[PDB]
Amino acid sequence: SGAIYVGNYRVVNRHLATHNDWANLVWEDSSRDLLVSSTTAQGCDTIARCDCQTGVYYCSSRRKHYPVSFSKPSLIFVEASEYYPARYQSHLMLAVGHSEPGDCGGILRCQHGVVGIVSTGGNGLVGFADVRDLLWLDEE
Ligand SMILES: O=C(NC1CC1)c1ccc2c(c1)OCO2
Ligand SMILES: [Zn+2]
């Protein structure tokens, strides 16, 4: 599990999105596994506007932050998880690391701030849903 809190906006994996998230929807995309919902109390995180391929992610199926090199956001054949079938996911940045289903929502961060959240995990690869192209989060 896990969310980003960029102001009064909560960023989560679309597949972990709660009834409250859907009842306070702002934007969602199934091909990315992203959804953003409105909050009443403000959060403590900032989004990265950059082309970094290095950072640190949180891996809940280990309780560790791991430093990683990660691939640029792309259309990636993911395969059967507990929460999706085998399929392509868009804007998925890839790194070599531990990612099980429940790791989803772990933050990937660089020197520029939050890069994205864990979305995918298979064959010793962790996949992150990029949020860097979503420029509209910082304002409004
Ligand atoms: O190891 C993977 N998981 C599923 C095969 C079981 C995996 C397969 C294809 C990918 C990928 C990850 O990231 C870029 O495209
Ligand atoms: Zn960066």
mmCIF file of C-alpha atoms and ligand atoms in Angstrom:
data_model
loop_
_atom_site.group_PDB
_atom_site.id
_atom_site.type_symbol
_atom_site.label_atom_id
_atom_site.label_comp_id
_atom_site.label_asym_id
_atom_site.label_seq_id
_atom_site.Cartn_x
_atom_site.Cartn_y
_atom_site.Cartn_z
ATOM 1 C CA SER A 1 0.000 0.000 0.000
ATOM 2 C CA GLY A 2 1.036 3.691 -0.088
ATOM 3 C CA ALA A 3 0.118 7.152 -1.369
ATOM 4 C CA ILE A 4 1.770 10.486 -2.373
ATOM 5 C CA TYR A 5 0.276 13.594 -0.630
ATOM 6 C CA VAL A 6 1.028 16.586 -2.961
ATOM 7 C CA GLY A 7 -0.958 19.385 -1.237
ATOM 8 C CA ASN A 8 -4.675 18.477 -0.904
ATOM 9 C CA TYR A 9 -4.265 15.601 -3.510
ATOM 10 C CA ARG A 10 -3.750 11.879 -2.630
ATOM 11 C CA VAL A 11 -1.980 9.806 -5.380
ATOM 12 C CA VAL A 12 -2.527 6.035 -5.205
ATOM 13 C CA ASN A 13 -2.399 2.955 -7.360
ATOM 14 C CA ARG A 14 -5.744 2.808 -9.288
ATOM 15 C CA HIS A 15 -6.210 -0.891 -8.034
ATOM 16 C CA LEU A 16 -5.858 0.095 -4.293
ATOM 17 C CA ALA A 17 -8.141 3.158 -4.707
ATOM 18 C CA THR A 18 -10.834 3.229 -1.948
ATOM 19 C CA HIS A 19 -14.573 4.066 -2.218
ATOM 20 C CA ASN A 20 -13.592 7.485 -0.634
ATOM 21 C CA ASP A 21 -10.939 7.975 -3.391
ATOM 22 C CA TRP A 22 -13.566 7.301 -6.123
ATOM 23 C CA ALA A 23 -16.102 9.531 -4.211
ATOM 24 C CA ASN A 24 -13.515 12.383 -4.270
ATOM 25 C CA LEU A 25 -11.998 11.621 -7.741
ATOM 26 C CA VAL A 26 -9.708 14.182 -9.547
ATOM 27 C CA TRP A 27 -8.199 11.950 -12.350
ATOM 28 C CA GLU A 28 -7.649 8.161 -13.070
ATOM 29 C CA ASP A 29 -5.948 5.944 -15.793
ATOM 30 C CA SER A 30 -6.175 2.089 -15.882
ATOM 31 C CA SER A 31 -3.262 1.808 -18.416
ATOM 32 C CA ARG A 32 -1.015 3.509 -15.710
ATOM 33 C CA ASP A 33 -2.556 2.097 -12.465
ATOM 34 C CA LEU A 34 -2.875 5.750 -11.190
ATOM 35 C CA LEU A 35 -5.756 7.579 -9.433
ATOM 36 C CA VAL A 36 -5.744 10.986 -7.637
ATOM 37 C CA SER A 37 -8.366 11.911 -4.956
ATOM 38 C CA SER A 38 -9.003 15.138 -2.910
ATOM 39 C CA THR A 39 -7.919 15.469 0.800
ATOM 40 C CA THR A 40 -9.150 17.853 3.592
ATOM 41 C CA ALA A 41 -5.784 17.859 5.521
ATOM 42 C CA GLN A 42 -2.559 18.705 3.553
ATOM 43 C CA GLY A 43 0.401 16.299 2.966
ATOM 44 C CA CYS A 44 4.224 16.601 3.294
ATOM 45 C CA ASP A 45 5.667 15.450 -0.177
ATOM 46 C CA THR A 46 6.788 17.149 -3.552
ATOM 47 C CA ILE A 47 6.866 15.700 -7.193
ATOM 48 C CA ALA A 48 10.079 15.435 -9.321
ATOM 49 C CA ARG A 49 10.179 17.337 -12.675
ATOM 50 C CA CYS A 50 13.276 15.680 -14.219
ATOM 51 C CA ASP A 51 14.745 12.835 -16.404
ATOM 52 C CA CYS A 52 16.662 11.114 -13.503
ATOM 53 C CA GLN A 53 17.213 7.335 -13.798
ATOM 54 C CA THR A 54 18.623 7.099 -10.197
ATOM 55 C CA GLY A 55 16.833 7.219 -6.844
ATOM 56 C CA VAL A 56 15.645 5.273 -3.801
ATOM 57 C CA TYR A 57 12.426 3.261 -3.427
ATOM 58 C CA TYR A 58 10.626 1.770 -0.414
ATOM 59 C CA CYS A 59 10.011 -2.017 -0.649
ATOM 60 C CA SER A 60 7.409 -3.146 1.949
ATOM 61 C CA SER A 61 8.020 -6.906 1.285
ATOM 62 C CA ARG A 62 11.543 -6.126 2.774
ATOM 63 C CA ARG A 63 10.997 -2.982 5.068
ATOM 64 C CA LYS A 64 14.013 -1.385 3.218
ATOM 65 C CA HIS A 65 14.698 1.688 1.070
ATOM 66 C CA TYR A 66 16.787 0.410 -1.908
ATOM 67 C CA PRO A 67 18.913 2.636 -4.135
ATOM 68 C CA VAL A 68 18.081 1.916 -7.844
ATOM 69 C CA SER A 69 18.778 2.788 -11.445
ATOM 70 C CA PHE A 70 15.432 2.864 -13.268
ATOM 71 C CA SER A 71 14.428 2.813 -16.980
ATOM 72 C CA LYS A 72 12.595 5.776 -18.621
ATOM 73 C CA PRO A 73 8.740 5.660 -18.518
ATOM 74 C CA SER A 74 7.530 3.175 -21.213
ATOM 75 C CA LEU A 75 4.894 0.608 -22.345
ATOM 76 C CA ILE A 76 5.901 -2.639 -20.552
ATOM 77 C CA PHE A 77 4.355 -6.148 -20.765
ATOM 78 C CA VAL A 78 3.479 -6.841 -17.097
ATOM 79 C CA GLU A 79 2.124 -10.368 -16.293
ATOM 80 C CA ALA A 80 -0.545 -11.902 -13.980
ATOM 81 C CA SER A 81 -0.455 -10.327 -10.473
ATOM 82 C CA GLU A 82 -3.007 -10.865 -7.632
ATOM 83 C CA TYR A 83 -4.759 -7.586 -8.775
ATOM 84 C CA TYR A 84 -4.327 -7.513 -12.663
ATOM 85 C CA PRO A 85 -4.007 -10.079 -15.521
ATOM 86 C CA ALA A 86 -0.938 -10.279 -17.850
ATOM 87 C CA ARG A 87 -0.972 -7.043 -19.939
ATOM 88 C CA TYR A 88 0.920 -3.887 -20.997
ATOM 89 C CA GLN A 89 1.051 -0.919 -18.548
ATOM 90 C CA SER A 90 2.078 2.599 -19.822
ATOM 91 C CA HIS A 91 4.500 5.117 -18.141
ATOM 92 C CA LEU A 92 6.102 2.198 -16.179
ATOM 93 C CA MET A 93 9.759 2.968 -15.227
ATOM 94 C CA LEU A 94 11.668 -0.270 -14.540
ATOM 95 C CA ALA A 95 14.481 -1.083 -12.112
ATOM 96 C CA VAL A 96 16.072 -4.360 -10.891
ATOM 97 C CA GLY A 97 14.647 -4.973 -7.389
ATOM 98 C CA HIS A 98 12.152 -6.820 -5.104
ATOM 99 C CA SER A 99 8.459 -5.995 -5.885
ATOM 100 C CA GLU A 100 5.553 -8.224 -4.715
ATOM 101 C CA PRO A 101 1.917 -7.050 -5.179
ATOM 102 C CA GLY A 102 1.575 -5.503 -1.649
ATOM 103 C CA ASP A 103 4.686 -3.341 -2.402
ATOM 104 C CA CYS A 104 2.467 -1.138 -4.626
ATOM 105 C CA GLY A 105 2.350 2.460 -3.447
ATOM 106 C CA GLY A 106 5.982 2.509 -2.173
ATOM 107 C CA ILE A 107 7.565 5.831 -3.056
ATOM 108 C CA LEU A 108 10.460 6.158 -5.556
ATOM 109 C CA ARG A 109 12.348 9.434 -4.797
ATOM 110 C CA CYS A 110 15.298 11.283 -6.529
ATOM 111 C CA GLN A 111 17.075 14.585 -5.618
ATOM 112 C CA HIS A 112 14.062 16.351 -7.309
ATOM 113 C CA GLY A 113 11.520 14.646 -4.883
ATOM 114 C CA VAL A 114 8.815 11.928 -5.473
ATOM 115 C CA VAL A 115 9.354 10.309 -8.946
ATOM 116 C CA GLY A 116 6.514 7.774 -8.730
ATOM 117 C CA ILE A 117 5.064 4.822 -6.845
ATOM 118 C CA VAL A 118 5.591 1.037 -7.042
ATOM 119 C CA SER A 119 2.986 -0.481 -9.378
ATOM 120 C CA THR A 120 4.427 -3.814 -10.734
ATOM 121 C CA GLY A 121 6.699 -6.684 -9.535
ATOM 122 C CA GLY A 122 7.944 -9.883 -11.260
ATOM 123 C CA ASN A 123 11.156 -11.852 -12.099
ATOM 124 C CA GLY A 124 13.329 -9.713 -9.758
ATOM 125 C CA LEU A 125 12.008 -6.454 -11.352
ATOM 126 C CA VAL A 126 10.123 -3.617 -9.587
ATOM 127 C CA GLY A 127 8.023 -1.330 -11.751
ATOM 128 C CA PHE A 128 7.155 2.247 -10.767
ATOM 129 C CA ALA A 129 4.207 4.313 -12.100
ATOM 130 C CA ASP A 130 5.754 7.572 -13.256
ATOM 131 C CA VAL A 131 4.012 10.782 -11.934
ATOM 132 C CA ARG A 132 6.653 13.192 -13.412
ATOM 133 C CA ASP A 133 4.660 13.831 -16.667
ATOM 134 C CA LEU A 134 1.514 14.771 -14.570
ATOM 135 C CA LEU A 135 2.644 18.492 -14.328
ATOM 136 C CA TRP A 136 -0.788 19.673 -12.985
ATOM 137 C CA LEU A 137 -0.347 18.111 -9.442
ATOM 138 C CA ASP A 138 1.807 20.949 -7.888
ATOM 139 C CA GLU A 139 -1.022 23.602 -8.292
ATOM 140 C CA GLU A 140 -4.849 24.080 -7.870
HETATM 141 O O1 LIG B 1 9.418 -10.160 -15.065
HETATM 142 C C1 LIG B 1 8.373 -9.672 -15.479
HETATM 143 N N1 LIG B 1 7.176 -10.017 -14.993
HETATM 144 C C2 LIG B 1 6.265 -10.893 -15.724
HETATM 145 C C3 LIG B 1 6.827 -11.924 -16.630
HETATM 146 C C4 LIG B 1 6.205 -12.325 -15.340
HETATM 147 C C5 LIG B 1 8.378 -8.666 -16.581
HETATM 148 C C6 LIG B 1 8.066 -9.056 -17.889
HETATM 149 C C7 LIG B 1 8.052 -8.137 -18.924
HETATM 150 C C8 LIG B 1 8.363 -6.826 -18.623
HETATM 151 C C9 LIG B 1 8.687 -6.441 -17.347
HETATM 152 C C10 LIG B 1 8.691 -7.337 -16.307
HETATM 153 O O2 LIG B 1 9.050 -5.114 -17.339
HETATM 154 C C11 LIG B 1 9.164 -4.769 -18.720
HETATM 155 O O3 LIG B 1 8.427 -5.740 -19.461
HETATM 156 ZN ZN ZN B 2 15.239 13.698 -10.593
#
